[PDB]
Symmetry: C3
Subunit: 27 residues, 3 copies
């Protein structure tokens, strides 16, 4: 369960980076 | 504590999906 | 490990709030 939480957070970090890039390009 | 972490991640997944939709509509 | 997961989630919550503000200003 703890390793699954760590994996989910790792995928979320990746999506956050992509979202910020997209918003940065617009701005 | 572990179940609280799982709940927080579930809410974050939901917000990520809504953010990507909004950015997708703009793009 | 559990406290590290809690810290990572706290930083993610902060980034989500900033992302939603930026998207809200655009919309
Ligand atoms: Cu990786
Ligand atoms: Cu649900
Ligand atoms: Cu703080």
């Amino acid at each position: 369960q703890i390793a699954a939480i760590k994996x989910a957070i790792a995928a979320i970090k990746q999506q956050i980076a992509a979202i910020k890039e997209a918003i940065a390009a617009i701005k």
